[PDB]
Swiss-Prot record, chains A, B, C, D:
This is Transthyretin. The gene is TTR. Changing residue 36 to T: In AMYLD1; amyloid cardiomyopathy. The lineage of its organism: Eukaryota, Metazoa, Chordata, Craniata, Vertebrata. Detected in serum and cerebrospinal fluid (at protein level). Highly expressed in choroid plexus epithelial cells. Detected in retina pigment epithelium and liver. Changing residue 24 to V: In AMYLD1; amyloid polyneuropathy.
């Protein structure tokens, strides 16, 4: 898969299960059009966000719904969500893995880009 | 100041000077209204963002312009920008410190909230 | 595998290839005895550090040689190395994954523990 | 002060008060010699670690006692402790700020070095 997102819970030391991930694409008119949507599973990854034939070049926004993940566990988090905005496939096809690591009051993101 | 943002460079080990930071406030109408803006100075921070009587309750979005700091250094970074979205002063007035730690391909955000 | 370490490069957005990882075990006499040794490969993981039959309970030290990885690329890093000290298998058998994310002047570690 | 260490709590969003921090100095003989020690106060930092004429060139190891801060809060954390090992004042005198950001299962360290 061209796009992979991994979400980790830094307070409980495990993958963040059922975190909602929404991918959008900046559409011609500077509008963000909905491009993919999933919920992480056990592993911490949402399955099959896109395919290599639809994952065209563009500016994608990956938005992770962090608020809801810590409110169901009883914690009141600082952020409303986590988002990553990046230009993809501009210089040619790559595979991107976005890693988010969560804590009620901090989050880190890292991209690991590869040449298929 | 009620809102302070500190931006740091993890490649060269110093504060990121002249990063533009913009603060918006979600307006009645789900609209983001510009509410403050500044550049990081020698210490890694934009001065005077706002005042304790302007900083009222609301959903605030802090946008750090990441791409322009790495590009001026010869680096082609992953992210378009960095943004932090949080609900402020809900519970009563506090002092928020946002810290941003930058690398071409990764960034962390941490919030330190202080007593009303 | 019971023990897995993943090392990532936050400045170049890829796995850290050829990073030396040494695992020790606090031996009866508070001495650290050498327990395993590897070098990461493409993926960012050293292969086969230990087996489930030797990975007994104990206090393990995972030491990552970060200095050498950034000096060969021309950068002069802040830390001499990165280390993670943890108690393993105390409450029963688990699988531990240690993730280190690197930058000349910062590093983060995260453990993702699982019940085999 | 030439050496300042700031320790922060990522679960509750505040500085970690009363974390014990110890600084050692690798002695002639590859020996670690105790060289300073303190507890984080209300602001997340131990005061007076050392003085500009005691802080000379050398390999320094800063050890943050992580396990005891999480255990006093009812949390059973992953790491025994946190340590930062760096060569100081090599190149001439500078001011180092070490920041530690804690979560039960993850920690980050960042160094901010300032002009001789």
């Amino acid at each position: 898969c061209p796009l992979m997102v991994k979400v980790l819970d830094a307070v409980r030391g495990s993958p963040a299960i059922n975190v909602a991930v929404h991918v959008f694409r900046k559409a011609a008119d500077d509008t963000w059009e909905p491009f993919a949507s999933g919920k992480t599973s056990e592993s911490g990854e949402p399955h099959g966000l896109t395919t290599e034939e639809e994952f065209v070049e563009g500016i994608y926004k990956v938005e992770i719904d962090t608020k809801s993940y810590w409110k169901a566990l009883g914690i009141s988090p600082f952020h409303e969500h986590a988002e990553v905005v990046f230009t993809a496939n501009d210089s040619g096809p790559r595979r991107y893995t976005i890693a988010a690591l969560l804590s009620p009051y901090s989050y880190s993101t890292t991209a690991v880009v590869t040449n298929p």
